[PDB]
């Protein structure tokens, strides 16, 4: 397991993201379904000019699987996948100017809600979880396990769990009081009021 610092203006978000008074967290599911969805429109353009690209899976889909033991809502796409290099190095580099942006929009009368046209919405999943798991699998890299409860660091690991294919899921372990967002009527809600018209099949489980 190997412990990495955050680049500082990506500490700094997580911070604010945490530490602001704003009540409106229910967005965090359409960003992380919207990321699922970039991924997917991804792997599908490839494909285009190279099938073999879908020989980890042809299933372009999504699922919302919510486990009230484990606490944990977890948030599984087959779309592209993110390498060792992304998770480590890449990512939070194209970040850095996002965070930028939004911190001086925030500023100025922008809200939270708007994280995602700076393309940094995944970050709004610590709005509801104490702790990120990111197992990942892109076509010609190993599968990855991304881990952060903040706090300025993460964590990243060859993952010897279950294989999935090629894909991401982002399993969110929820903070002690906002379980809700493991209801299944609260979910089908949240998903028909920010995600209706997501142009793939989104499954949400139920326990
Ligand atoms: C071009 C690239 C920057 N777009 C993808 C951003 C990374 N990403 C994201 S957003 C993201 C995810 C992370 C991350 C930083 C970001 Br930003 O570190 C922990 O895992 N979600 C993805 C997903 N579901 N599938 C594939 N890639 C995902």
Known sequence: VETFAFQAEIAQLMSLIINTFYSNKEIFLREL???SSDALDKIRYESLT???KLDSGKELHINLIPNKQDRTLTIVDT???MTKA???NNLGTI???GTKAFMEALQAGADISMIGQFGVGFYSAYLVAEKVTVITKHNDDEQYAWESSAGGS???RTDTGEPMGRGTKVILHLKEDQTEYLEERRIKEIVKKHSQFIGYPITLFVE
């Open 154 to 156: 993460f964590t990243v």
């Open 50 to 52: 190279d099938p073999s």
């Open 33 to 35: 379904i919207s990321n």
């Open 79 to 81: 779309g592209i996948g």
């Open 95 to 97: 970040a850095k100017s």
């Open 86 to 88: 992304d998770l480590i």
